[PDB]
Curated annotation (Swiss-Prot):
Residues 17-328 form the Peptidase A1 domain. GO terms for biological process: proteolysis. Keywords: Aspartyl protease, Disulfide bond, Hydrolase, Protease, Signal, Zymogen. The keyword Transmembrane does not apply. Belongs to the peptidase A1 family. It is an enzyme of class 3 (hydrolase). The keyword DNA repair does not apply. Its EC number is 3.4.23.22. The chain holds residues 90 to 419 of 419 of the full protein. It comes from Cryphonectria parasitica (Chestnut blight fungus). One of its GO terms (molecular function) is aspartic-type endopeptidase activity. This is Endothiapepsin.
Amino acid sequence: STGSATTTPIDSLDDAYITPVQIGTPAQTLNLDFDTGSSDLWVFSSETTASEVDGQTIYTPSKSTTAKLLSGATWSISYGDGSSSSGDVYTDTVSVGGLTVTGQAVESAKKVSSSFTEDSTIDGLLGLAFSTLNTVSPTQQKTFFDNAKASLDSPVFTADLGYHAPGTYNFGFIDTTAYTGSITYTAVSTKQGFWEWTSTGYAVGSGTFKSTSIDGIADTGTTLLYLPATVVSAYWAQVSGAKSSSSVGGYVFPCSATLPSFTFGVGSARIVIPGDYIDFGPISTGSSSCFGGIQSSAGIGINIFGDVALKAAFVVFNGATTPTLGFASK
């Protein structure tokens, strides 16, 4: 089997991407944030505290003939941005882009933090990291990809995120028309539960490539690119007037600037992030100070190849017995 779904930016900044997901019988379509940095599929639901729902589409298990309460199971998750959610668990039929999994754990939110309530466009998350991170207790549950894997033509999924435009998540095949040149594959460590890999270096604009190992995770659920302070400083030093602002929470730059590209290494290959991808616009409406798309990972504890980086590439998440990651230009 295979699946193919379009993913769509939630706003003009590509702050996140949503992908339609069918849950239940008859289908209940929710728009979920596919997150290769977590491993819970959770949704806004009929069980979610009423005051914490504001515009989202909810899953109603009682209207699904294939829904079954997973007795005794609860879940609770906190994300890197400080947001959180929790609730109980159903099993139900879940389909993505024509690919169907029966008995998928669907984690029904009883509580969500403000950040989720305030974002009317995201109805939940679908995690695509390794199932060892799944928070369901007392019986840990598998991700959608884990459940689908054995049935897929090839045990892979691909992320093809657009810049200010729709893109595609494919399951079970590699669309050879969707990228240019070759796919360069690189080793993955699953030790922390993530799609963790080591970049071979970086360049700023038309500058020379610095060979240096950067360990990080491929995380579709994180908006920006978080790298070591040394790297980030070298980038923003090439932008007149750029500075790190503690009051804003990172590097800002004059909105009148032309941003340089940023290149990262994948083995001997190079992925180029155009300067425009690194612009996240005014810090507040009408401001002439703009927020940077490359930020320091210092105090996150991990480097994160988020959407700013991934959308510059066609990315293969290879879930073979020994997982790998592939990157191609497109």
